[PDB]
Symmetry: C2
């Protein structure tokens, strides 16, 4: 990842965001040492050209992402197209991002609030993805 290619990465980020929105639910894979872990995730938003996911700083999945920032996401839309997005995540501790998350995905307010001490937002510092279709060439992108 290079900051001066941010114009290119932005287009890949927007495609990933769009596609993950089409999927609705998607699956986030982490490691706990040599044990893979996977669970459904369902909230994504953009801020300052970055793709964010949300979690809770008390959860195993969060602790896993801190201990090993490498993750992979996969999901499928109603047409049977699917994504694989490989990358690294960083926790963003800025209060303003938490506020924005709750406005972008207001259903989050059912569980989280800005000053609850548990709400976490994390973004992809880098990543590479492929969107696969039954018919047609793979679409590849970077963020």
């Amino acid at each position: 990842h290079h900051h001066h290619h941010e114009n290119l990465y932005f287009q890949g980020m927007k495609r990933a965001l769009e596609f993950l929105k089409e999927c609705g639910v998607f699956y986030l894979a982490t490691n706990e040492g040599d044990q893979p872990r996977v669970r459904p995730f369902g909230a994504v938003f953009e801020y300052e050209g970055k793709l964010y996911i949300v979690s809770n700083n008390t959860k195993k999945c969060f602790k896993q992402m801190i201990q090993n920032p490498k993750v992979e996401i996969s999901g499928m839309n109603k047409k049977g197209q699917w994504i694989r997005l490989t990358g690294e995540v960083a926790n963003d501790d800025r209060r303003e991002v938490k506020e924005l998350a709750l406005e972008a995905v207001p259903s989050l307010k059912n569980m989280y609030s800005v000053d609850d001490g548990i709400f976490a937002v994390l973004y992809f510092t880098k990543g590479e993805g492929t969107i696969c279709s039954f018919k047609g060439e793979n679409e590849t992108f970077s963020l």
Copy 2:
């Protein structure tokens, strides 16, 4: 024969649930890099839960290098599963034959003696089924 059912009950519950899911997600490691992709089939053979792959795929190679995996997926009722375990390859023709009858879409690509088709079963595992509202079991 509750005692005897125990060999089967966790596996049967996982099988039933993953069939309800249709598509589920299989996570492996490639060293320190987690990997996940959609899977679309499951079958049982003599009390064990099987999945399919082919021996040229990265996912298969990853499962041989590190047998630890986790599966997750959601059914049509707002429930989801987390199934953690270890997998083993099974080279037997008889199991591959049953696979092709249990999952007939495979016949489109695979045959028992094609040198590529692979089936793997859970040697052990632990599952949890959750709802927006937890059932746990062991394979």
